[PDB]
Amino acid sequence: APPLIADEFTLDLPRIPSLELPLNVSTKHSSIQKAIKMCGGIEKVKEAFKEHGPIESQHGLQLYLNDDTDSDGSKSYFNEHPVIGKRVPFRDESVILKVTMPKGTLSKNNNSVKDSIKSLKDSNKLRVTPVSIVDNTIKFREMSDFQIKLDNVPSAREFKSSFGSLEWNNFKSFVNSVPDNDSQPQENIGNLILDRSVKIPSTDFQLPPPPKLSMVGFPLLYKYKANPFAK
Amino acid sequence: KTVYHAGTKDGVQALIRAVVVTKSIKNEIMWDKITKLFPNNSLDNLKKKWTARRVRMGHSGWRAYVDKWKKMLVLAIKSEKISLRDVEELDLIKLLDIWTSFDEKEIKRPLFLYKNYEENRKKFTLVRDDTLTHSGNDLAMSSMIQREISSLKKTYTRKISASTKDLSKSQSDDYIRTVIRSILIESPSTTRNEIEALKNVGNESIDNVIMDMAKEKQIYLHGSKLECTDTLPDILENRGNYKDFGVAFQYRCKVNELLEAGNAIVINQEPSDISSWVLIDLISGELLNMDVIPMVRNVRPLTYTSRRFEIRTLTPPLIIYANSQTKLNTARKSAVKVPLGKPFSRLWVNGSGSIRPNIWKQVVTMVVNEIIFHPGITLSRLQSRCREVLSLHEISEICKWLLERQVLITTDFDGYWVNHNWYSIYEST
Amino acid sequence: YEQWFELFMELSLVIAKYQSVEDGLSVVETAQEVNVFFQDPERVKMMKFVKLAIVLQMDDEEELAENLRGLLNQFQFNRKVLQVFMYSLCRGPSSLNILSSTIQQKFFLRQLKAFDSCRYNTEVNGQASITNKEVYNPNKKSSPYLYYIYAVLLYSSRGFLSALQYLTRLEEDIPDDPMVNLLMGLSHIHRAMQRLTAQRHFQIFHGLRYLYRYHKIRKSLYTDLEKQEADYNLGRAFHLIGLVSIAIEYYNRVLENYDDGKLKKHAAYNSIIIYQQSGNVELADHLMEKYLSI
Amino acid sequence: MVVNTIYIARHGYRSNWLPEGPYPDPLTGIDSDVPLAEHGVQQAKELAHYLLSLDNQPEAAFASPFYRCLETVQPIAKLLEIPVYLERGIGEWYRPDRKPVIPVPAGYEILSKFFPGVISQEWDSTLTPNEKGETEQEMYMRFKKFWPLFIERVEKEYPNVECILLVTHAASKIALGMSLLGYDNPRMSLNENGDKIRSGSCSLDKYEILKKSYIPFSDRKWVLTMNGNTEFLSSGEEMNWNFDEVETVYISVDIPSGNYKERTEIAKSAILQYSGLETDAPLFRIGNRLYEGSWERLVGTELAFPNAAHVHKQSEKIYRIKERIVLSNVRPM
DNA sequence: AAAAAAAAAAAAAAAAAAAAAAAAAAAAAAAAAAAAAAAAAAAAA
DNA sequence: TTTTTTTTTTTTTTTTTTTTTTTTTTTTTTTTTTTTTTTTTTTTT
C-alpha cells in the first residue's frame, strides 16, 4: 500500500517576538505573569521588540530581580538598578510546534514534553501543528549595576519610608527637617536627623549613589594586560 | 561502458559514487576497478580529488553516501535491477548507471515526508551541513558592538536527550580529536593507518574524524599524512597566559613582605601589568589598606581644573600596606598530583604519561584565563569554547584538579569558579 | 488649608502608587500655581519633593531632569536637597543621561563657584548668584554635598579624571563617609579603562583605595544586613571591570552569609548572566529557580 | 493567474447560542438567519488579525448570503482592504424535513443596507442550493458541482486572484473541504488515523496546491495544510459540528546560522512536515530544505508571543517554550 | 635706588592632532564557459 | 576498399565570481597650543 504521506503544513504563519528571561518559570500562569512583572511588565516587553538601531544606542528592556514589597507598599529594594536586555540583531527564524495530547500525559511522563509524546507513539490522540514563527528575540546579557542598601543609613531609611513608600505619613517628616537656608553645608546631614534608632558612625555623611555606579553595563574590558595602545 | 574524464562536471560525481560502491561492498577502495572508468586521468590525480571530496563532506557526508548507496542497492536487488553476482563481481558500470537511474527518478519527486518514521529513515539519506560547527567561538572580540551583538545572539540551553550521536560513541569521537591534537603538537605530521594510538576505536570513525579535522583546518592533509597546523600553538600562545600569572605569584612576594612595615612600596609610577593581576586580588583578599604620600597642593579660590592640576596629585602616589584586621590568602594550595590520563589523552599529556609542562602551563592558564572571565562553567560550554583545543574528557581533569588545589571552587551542578589568589598556580614552595 | 494641602499631597502619592500617574502630577503642579499652598515656602519645598518621588514611579530622562533643575535652584546649597537628587537618580538607565548631560554639569560647576564666592566673600568668574543668605561657614570647609554631585556629573559623562578631582576635594574634608569613597574609587577605575592612558595599572589601584575604604567603613561600622551591599558592590565592581571570579567570591558572600533575600536575586542574576557565558547552564537554571523563580 | 490558496472559515458565535435574552430579531425578517453575539464578532476580529499576519492575504472573500456569514466578514473586508462577493453556492445546509420552512436568504439589495461598502454586486452566484432542502447525497454533489464551475469563473472574472477566502456554515465548511480534496463522501476521515475537518465557530481551513517544476481545474491536487485552525482565537474550539480531556505544550524549532553576523530564514508560503517527534531526533522539511535536530531544554524560559505578531498588509495568550529542538541543516541527496 | 612697564611662564581652556576601529575597495583565486583541436563515424567513390 | 566529410568529444582558454587584504573614514583620547593672569626682570627717571 502506498506509504502514508505526513501532513504538509504551511510556514506562512504569524511571526512572533520572544524573550529569554534567565528566570526558570513553572508551567503555571501564576509563575509566568510575575516573571513578566519583573522585566517591566506586559507593556515594555512588547515595546522592547520595536526598538530598531545599532546595538549601543538601544536602551534595552529592564529586568528587576526583586519585585519584593515592604508592608508600606514600597519597592522593598527601590535601590534596584536593574539588569538590561537588548534585542538580538541576528536572530535566525524558528517555527513553534503545538502538541495537543491527553490530560495528565505530562504528570504520567516525567513532566517531559518529549516522553509525553513518546508514550502515545501507537495512538490517534497525538496532534501536532506548526502554529507560529519566532523571528526576533531579546536576551538579558547586560548585568544589574552596583546596588547600595538604604535600611541602616538613617536618611536612606528616611528616603525609602518617604519617596520609596510614597507614604505622606512617613514623607512629610523627611521634607520637614530639610533646611530652607542650609545653616551649615560643611556638616554631616545627621545634624538634621531625628531618628538615632540606627547607630550610624560619625564619619558617614550619607551620600547617595548615582543611578549608574557602573557607566558601561557589559564589562569594560580591564583584562589587566600591558596596554600596547598607551603611547 | 560509461566512462568519464575527471575534469567533466559529472565525472567528479562518478568518482565519488565508485569509491562508495567499491568500499561499501569489498571493505576497500578498489583503485584497479575505479581507474577503468577514468582512462584519461592518473591514479594519484583521482586519489587527490577523492580525498579532497571526503574532506569537504566530512563524517556527516561519507556515511550519508554509503547509507544512500546501501538503501539504493537494497531497492535495486528487490526490483531485479541487480543480481547478487553484480555485487560479488563489483561491475562498477552497472552499479553507476543504476545509481544514475535512481537519482533520475527521485529528481522527479517534490520531496515530501512519510508520516511513518522508518519509511523516512529508508527513503531519505541525510547530510548534516555543518554551518553551526558547535565550535563555541566568538573570535578574539574586543569592540562593544562585537561583544553585545555576539552575546545577544548566543545560545542558552541544555540537551534533554543524549545527542543524535550516541554519547558512548561520541566518547570515542572527541577522544580521537584529542589523541590527534595531542600528537600534532608532538609531531609536524602523522599517518592515520599505522601510527595512531586509537585503533581499539573503529578505524572508520578515526578516518571520519580525520576528514572533519581537515575540514575544520585543525590539520592539513598531504595524502596519508595528517600535518600539524601552527594555528593550535598560536591559539595557546594568544589565549594561554602563563607568564603573567608566573610574574604574579612573584609579585605576591614583592607586595606581601613589605605590607606589615606600614611604610612600604609606594605606587608612584606605572606598576607592571602583572602587578595589577596581584594587587587587585590581594586588595580584594582584605590584606590591604592604602596610604597617601601627603603631596601639598595649590588649591585656590576661582580655580576649577583636573587634567594636570598639580599633575601627579590626582594619583597622589600611594603607600600600599597591611590592613590591621585580616589575611584571607594563606597556604590554601597543596601538591595535588597532576591530571594525567592515557598516553596522549588530554592536550597536555605527553607520550610518557607526564605533562608537556609548558603546554600544561599554557593550557591550565588558558582554562583559568577562560574561567577568570567565565565562572560557573560546565565541562560542555568549556568543551565548545575550547573546541579548537580541548574536548570534554580533557576539561574535567583540569577543572576538578583546580577544585582540589582550591584555585577553583564549585557551585551546584559542577559549575567551576576561582576563589582569590588564583593566578598563583606556580608558587615558590 | 493645610488640610487641603495634606489631601492634595497624600492623594497625588496614592494615585502615583497605581496606573495613570499623570493624574497625580496634575494635583501637585496645580498646587504649585495655587497661592493658598505656594505662598508657604516649606510647602513649595514639599510639592517639588512629592512630584520628584512620583516621577520615579513613571520612567523618563527629560521630565525627571526638569523637576530636579526646578528644586536645586530654589533651596540653594542645601544638603537634603542635594541628597534627594542623588537618591532619585537610581532606577532606570534613563536617569544616567541626567548625569552624563553637560546641561547639569555646568549647573554644578556654577553652584561650586557660588559656594566659593560666599566662603571667601569675593566675586567668582561665572558663579551662580546667592539668594539663600544665612549660609555660614566660619571654619571655611567645602560643602561635601556640592563636591560630590559635581564629581558625579563629571563621573557620568565619562569625565572620570574630572570626577576624581571633586572626590579628592571631598576626601580633604569628610575622610571616612561611604559614598564619597565608593564614587571616588569608581571614577579612578572608569577613567583607567580608556584606550591609551599613561599609568593605566596605577589608575586602577587608586580605584581600590576608595572602594576598600568604603568596604572597611561599611563592614566595621554598620549592621550585618547592610554590610551585605559592601559585599555585593565590591563584587559588582570586579564584574564591571571584567575581573569576574573576584566578583563571584563577593556575589557568593551575598548568597551564603546573609538572610535578607533582596541582594541574593542580584548576586544570583549577575551569577546566572556569567554562568550563561561560562555555561554552567544547569547551575544557572538551578540558581534561577532557587532565588528568581516564583 | 491560477489560485494557489483557498481559505474556508465557519461564521462567528450565533446570538441564539447565548444563555439569556433578549435574543435579537433576524434583521432580514427571514426564519433562522440570526446575527452574531459580540463574542462571535470578537472571534471574527481574531480570525482577521490571524489572516492579516500572513503575507498570503486573501484577494477577496466569498460570503454565504446568510446574515451571520456577512457579519463575520465586515471586520475582515475593512481590515485587509478586499471586496466581498455573495455566493449562494456557499449557503447553509438544510434537510427536506426541516420546519416550519427552508430558509434561503434575500439578495444584494437587502444585505447592502446592513453591510454598506463591504459587499460588491460584480459577481453572479455559481449555483443556488435546493429551496426544498437537500439530502446528504444532493448536498455533497452540489458542492462537488460548485468547485469546478466556481474556480473556472473566479479565474476568468478575477484573473489576478492567487488567494481567496470563503466564510460559511458548519456543513458548508466540511462538505466544501472533503469535495475539494476529492473524497467519496463527507463522513470519510482525512487519514487512516481518523482525523476530520475541525469546524467550530471561526475555525480556519487552508487548502494549498502541490507545486509544478493557465491550468484546467481537473488536473489539480491539494493538501488541507491548515486543519480547522483555532490557535489564534482566544477561546479555542467552540460549538464544533461534524459529519457522523487534553493538555497543551510547545516545542521550538530553532534553525541556527553559523556566523553570528549572518541570519538564516524561512521562505514565504513554504511547507513543513514532521516525523519521529517520539524519537531521539525527529525529521523535518521547510520549503524544499530538510533537517534533523537534538532535543534541548533552556536555561531560563523563552516566552514567545502570538498576541504580539507583526502586521504585513483574560490571561493574555503566551507560550512558555522551555523545551526545543535545534535543527542542524540536514539536506537530502 | 625705587617704581613702572613689559615680557614670559603657568594654569586653564579650547581646538586640533593622533590613534583605533570600521567600512569599502582592490586584488587574488576559483569556477564556469567558450573555443579549438582531435578522434570517430558516416557517406561516397 | 578507400577517401572525404560531418559530428562528437576532449582540451585549452577566457571570463566571472568569491575571498582576502589594504585603504579610507569616523570616533575617541591625549597632547599641544592658545589665551589670560601673575610674577619677575629690565630699563628709565
Residue numbers in the entry:
A (entry chain C): 21 to 251
B (entry chain A): 732 to 1160
C (entry chain B): 732 to 1025
D (entry chain D): 1 to 213, 228 to 258, 290 to 358, 416 to 435
The authors write:
Transcription of transfer RNA (tRNA) genes by RNA polymerase (Pol) III requires the general transcription factor IIIC (TFIIIC), which recognizes intragenic A-box and B-box DNA motifs of type II gene promoters. To adapt to these naturally varying distances, TFIIIC interacts with the A-box and B-box through its two subcomplexes, τA and τB, respectively, which are connected by a flexible linker. Our study addresses this gap by determining cryo-EM structures of the yeast τA and τB subcomplexes bound to A-box and B-box, respectively, in their fully engaged state in complex with a tRNA gene promoter.
In yeast τA, four domains interact with the tRNAHis gene: the helical domain (aa 732–838) and WH6 (aa 972–1053) in τ138, TPR15 in τ131 (aa 908–953) and the DNA-interacting loop (aa 247–251) in τ95 (bottom). Although several τA domains are involved, each domain establishes only a relatively small interface, mostly via electrostatic interactions with the DNA phosphate backbone. This binding mode may account for the weak DNA-binding affinity of τA, potentially becoming stabilized by additional factors such as TFIIIB. While the relatively low resolution of DNA in the τA subcomplex did not allow us to assign a more precise register of DNA sequence recognition, we observed a pronounced overall DNA curvature suggesting DNA shape recognition. Notably, the loop insertion of τ95 (aa 247–251) and τ131 (aa 908–953) into the minor groove of the A-box might contribute to a combined DNA sequence and shape readout, but based on our cryo-EM analysis we cannot exclude contributions by other, more dynamic interactions.
